[PDB]
């Protein structure tokens, strides 16, 4: 695989708090991107595919962005609710599903 | 729309399987191949393997790489994980969920995530 | 313990040979054809447990107890299982899962049976069943006698249709190998093996053995015949023969409209299929049809490649029988031999996360169309509620953009498809996959084995002009005797192996035993 | 349908992941799409069929990315390597090749 | 695969080119040649492309009676033939195997234009 | 138009059809073609 992490870990920020998660792979993804978070005591929820164009849900203060090598799922402005881990998976175009660490975005 | 009911929460021991069932919510799933979400504990995710019953052999979990035997049996009803060789490294939460290459041509809201339950395996 | 010993390889001599019927018989010399121990053969005298095969017979001789005689050393197999222990000459026909390696001193399995000083000799021999048991202990003179005529008379049949492959002894070991080898016994007048010749161990013998006699007079015998000759040259018709529109339904960019079933007639050949093997999982390699191989042997005229884009839900039903929503409506499949449709997804290929609605198809176009047509007609569809058109409001198009999604199932996700449908009743086949260029065509050495039409022979080249339509040349008398070379030139003459009759010219057995051939 | 190597003398060093725009004009399919790498002086070699894929003969240094009208080359981490001319083709509607962007040196 | 190639062509404002492209060592009859023209500096000007199966022929209007695709089939050696020839016209081209028109029925295919020639380096220079 | 009969071809060293003899034409190509040879010595022949 190309073995999904992410190159901002546990970025931590509070509400607004101008932000850029990133989840740069080993290597290059191009427009083969997940960018998930998880919602705590339930079942995870992939927010972004390749690179951007958010699901309908979850909405768009988790906002995706970044086209190369590092693709950038940046928050406009979250709120207190907002905390939320940020791993992401990789869909690969045949199914490989590797998921990340968690750059969760927090409040005090 | 569509569910997805999952099995349950118990602990399983090492060397033995541990069985769970993403089981059938009144149709919907031919398409959606039930693959299979794991949950590490509290470190980090993971995706338990599935098995690819939409006409072809299946899909191993890159994590495990071996003795993940992910059958799922989608005309029975159920789905299972059918982790041989199991130990401890479980604790976790394993997610049944309609992982992306699971959509209906209906239910595009549920679009290519219709998760599950969750499942507490640990020792 | 491990009371392990050597190994040596020995002169199996002028022994080995047992009675091979139960047939009396007197002052004759029977020409036998059964499995011996060819005379002066190598015997590996072993002083050490090993797992010695079982190939065909064991002339199994010993000088200080029993052999396991099975196929797997283990509790699985029905190994047999002898012993010879001074209370009975008995046996064990149990599994007892590898007795550790000698001496237990048990599984489900079978019946039971009873009854370094000298020769305890034993020729093993299974043949389909009655694993047969021909010994004789000589009590030889020490040392002095591995060798000595004595022949080996039947102990026991024991009808076992069960297929032995290995044995050992247990507590000398010279383990011989039988094989199909003709003898000619000479049985005195009271009934007893006295000697035996080997017919194919030398020239002279070959010669008593043809004589049916131990003694031969002085003269010139005709013994035999010789030849054989083995190397494959397969040199083949074909050149450059143009493959096949395969390797471009496989690799095409743009396929047809999903009822306009892009059905060629796959042209010439050489579709000799092989790059159907190569390719990358395809998700759907189940031959509709003919079992996944042999197509690239099998010639068939034309396989007719169709050529359309689905998705998944749509794919389900590409297949024989499997009649369903667009095998229902758009593009159906006949009882079998669909050649060897090879579906795939096309993700990436045919739809965008845009959600392409690209690709038109007919869902409602009127109802199932009958199996393997081509469809370019797209019949409107029959919805009733109204006379004028059929169509019920208006407009009810079989006209669908197949209007999927990356984001879907498979069974919406982007499908490129490649079908096939062979023919093969009508003027011969076109489409074939013949092998070619075995090598270097092989003048001279009795090799170059055939070439184009079978020959076997010496085949080289020629000085003969074959008026250039001409392929291959006769003699007088039917009997090829010059070819061309299919993929280049080269007019081959070619010329059988080689033969005649070894004859054995022989002062007479009284004066010498020394042969010129 | 046209084709535009927007960086034409793309100057960055190796070792560092650079943006190389070869930028069509239509919303293209990379299906058809391609890039094609020649030596400075040479036959194109076959770079990127898919237009952002790696075959067989590219190494992991070479990267890129792109659709719509603004195909962009997100070349990685660059060698002498990726130092030959690169013409990102058009399969689709009667092929243009591309006559631009290298990435340069010092 | 070598596609071997013409060189440094001497053709004159005036004449004919039989470009040589030595159809290397794949089934020439399986496949179809297309060609590009590097101008120098212009990239590749498309050239055409000949069906080694059949001669299907997609010229360039450009050199529409100038560029007349032709082969040895039997020493299958491509010969791309541009009248036309001058200095402003000597410029370089290449061969390629067109598989973007998959051969055999001049329609496009999956892959692109594939191994390619040598080098025809026409040097018309005057 | 072609007819089902019974020829006599002489193929000659290099390959070539020099000559051909029709067996049922008349008394003398029969005896040429039970003879198979194209000089029949002086003699009675059982021909057919």
């Not at chain 1, 699901?55 to 207190?80: A, C, H, M, N």
């Not at chain 3, 009975?88 to 149990?94: M, Q, R």
């Not at chain 3, 390699?285 to 396989?303: A, I, Q, R, W």
């Not at chain 3, 198809?361 to 370019?376: A, G, M, N, Q, V």
Request: glycine letters at 8%; hydrophobic letters at 35%; proline letters at 5%.
């Amino acid at each position: 695989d190309i073995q999904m992490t992410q190159s901002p870990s546990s970025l931590s920020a509070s509400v607004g708090d101008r932000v850029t998660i990133t989840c740069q792979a080993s290597q290059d993804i191009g427009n083969y991107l997940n960018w998930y978070q998880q919602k705590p005591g339930k079942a995870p929820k992939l927010l972004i595919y390749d690179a951007s164009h958010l699901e309908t849900g979850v909405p768009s203060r988790f906002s995706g962005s970044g086209s190369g090598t590092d693709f950038t799922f940046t928050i406009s402005s979250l709120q207190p609710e907002d905390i939320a881990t940020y791993y992401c998976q990789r869909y690969d175009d045949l199914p490989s599903y590797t998921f990340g660490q968690g750059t969760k975005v927090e409040i005090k | 729309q569509v569910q997805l009911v999952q099995s349950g929460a118990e602990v399983k021991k090492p060397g033995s399987s541990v069985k769970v069932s993403c089981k059938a919510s009144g149709g919907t799933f031919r398409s959606h191949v039930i693959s299979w979400v794991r949950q590490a504990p509290g470190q980090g995710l993971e995706w338990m393997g599935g098995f690819i019953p939409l006409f072809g052999t299946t899909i191993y979990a890159q994590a495990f790489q071996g003795r993940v035997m992910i059958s799922a049996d989608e005309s029975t009803s159920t789905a299972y994980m059918e982790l041989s060789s199991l130990r401890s490294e479980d604790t976790a939460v394993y997610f049944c969920a309609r992982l992306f290459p699971n959509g209906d041509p209906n239910s595009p809201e549920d679009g290519f995530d219709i998760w599950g339950q969750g499942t507490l395996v640990t020792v | 313990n491990l009371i392990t010993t050597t190994q040596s390889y020995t002169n199996s001599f002028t022994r080995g040979v047992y009675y091979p019927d139960k047939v009396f018989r007197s002052s004759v010399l029977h020409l036998t054809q059964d499995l011996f121990l060819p005379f002066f053969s190598n015997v590996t005298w072993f002083h050490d447990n090993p797992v010695l095969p079982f190939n065909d017979g064991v002339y199994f001789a010993s000088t200080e107890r029993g052999w396991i005689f099975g196929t797997t050393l283990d509790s699985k197999t029905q190994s047999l299982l002898i012993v010879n222990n001074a209370t009975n000459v008995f046996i064990k026909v149990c599994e007892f899962q590898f007795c550790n390696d000698p001496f237990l001193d048990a599984n489900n399995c079978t019946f039971e049976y009873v009854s370094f000083k000298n020769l305890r000799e034993f020729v093993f021999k299974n043949i389909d069943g009655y694993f047969k048991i021909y010994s004789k202990h000589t009590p030889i003179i020490g040392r002095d006698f591995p060798q000595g005529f004595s022949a080996l008379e039947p102990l026991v049949d024991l009808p076992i249709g069960i297929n032995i492959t290995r044995f050992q002894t247990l507590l000398d070991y010279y383990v011989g190998y039988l094989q199909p080898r003709t003898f000619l016994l000479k049985y005195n007048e009271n009934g007893t093996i006295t000697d035996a010749v080997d017919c194919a161990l030398d020239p002279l013998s070959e010669t008593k053995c043809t004589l049916k006699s131990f003694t031969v007079e002085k003269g010139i015998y005709q013994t035999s015949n010789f030849r054989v000759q083995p190397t494959e040259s397969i040199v083949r018709f074909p050149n450059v023969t143009n493959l096949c529109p395969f390797h471009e339904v496989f690799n095409a960019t743009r396929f047809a409209s999903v009822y306009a079933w892009n059905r060629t007639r796959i042209s010439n050949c050489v579709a000799d299929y092989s790059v159907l093997y190569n390719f990358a999982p395809f998700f759907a390699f189940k031959c509709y049809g003919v079992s996944p191989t042999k197509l690239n042997d099998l010639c068939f005229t034309n396989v007719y490649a169709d050529s359309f884009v689905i998705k998944g839900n749509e794919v389900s039903q590409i297949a024989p029988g499997q009649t369903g929503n667009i095998a229902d409506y758009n593009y159906k499949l006949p009882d079998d031999f669909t050649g060897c449709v090879i579906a795939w997804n096309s993700n990436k290929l045919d739809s965008k996360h845009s959600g392409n609605y690209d690709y038109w198809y007919r869902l409602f176009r009127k109802s199932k169309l009958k199996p393997f047509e081509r469809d370019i007609s797209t019949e409107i569809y029959q919805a009733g509620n109204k006379p004028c058109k059929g169509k019920g409001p208006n407009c009810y198009f079989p006209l669908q953009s197949y209007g999927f999604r990356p984001t879907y199932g498979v069974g919406h996700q982007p499908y490129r498809v490649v079908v096939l449908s062979f023919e093969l009743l009508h003027a011969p086949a076109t489409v074939c996959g013949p092998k070619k260029s075995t090598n270097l065509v092989k003048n001279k050495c009795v090799n170059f084995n055939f070439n184009g039409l079978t020959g076997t022979g010496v085949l080289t080249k020629s000085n003969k002009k074959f008026l250039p339509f001409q392929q291959f040349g006769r003699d007088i008398v039917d009997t090829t005797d010059a070819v061309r070379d299919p993929q280049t030139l080269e007019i081959l003459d070619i010329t059988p192996c080689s033969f005649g009759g070894v004859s054995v010219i022989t002062p007479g057995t009284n004066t010498s035993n020394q042969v010129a051939v | 349908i046209v084709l535009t190597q927007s960086p034409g003398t793309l100057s960055l060093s190796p070792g560092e992941r650079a943006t190389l725009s070869c930028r069509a004009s239509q919303t293209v399919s990379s299906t058809s799409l391609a890039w094609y790498q020649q030596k400075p002086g040479q036959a194109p070699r076959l770079l990127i069929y898919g237009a952002s894929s790696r075959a067989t003969g590219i190494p992991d240094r070479f990267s890129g990315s792109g659709s719509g009208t603004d195909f962009t080359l997100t070349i990685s981490r660059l060698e002498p390597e990726d130092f030959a001319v690169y013409y990102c083709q058009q399969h689709d509607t009667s092929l243009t090749f591309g006559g631009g962007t290298k990435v340069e040196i010092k | 695969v070598q596609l071997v190639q013409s060189g440094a062509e001497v053709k004159k404002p005036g004449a004919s080119v039989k470009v040589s492209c030595k159809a290397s060592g794949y089934p020439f009859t399986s496949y179809g040649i297309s060609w590009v023209r590097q101008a120098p500096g212009q990239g590749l000007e498309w050239m055409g492309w000949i069906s080694t199966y059949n001669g299907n022929t997609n010229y360039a209007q450009k050199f529409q009676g100038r560029v007349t695709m032709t082969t040895d089939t039997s020493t299958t050696t491509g010969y791309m033939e541009l009248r036309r020839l001058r200095s402003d016209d000597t410029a370089v081209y290449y061969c390629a195997r067109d598989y973007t028109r998959g051969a055999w029925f001049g329609e496009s295919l999956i892959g692109g234009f594939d191994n390619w020639g040598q080098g025809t380096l026409v040097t018309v220079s005057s």
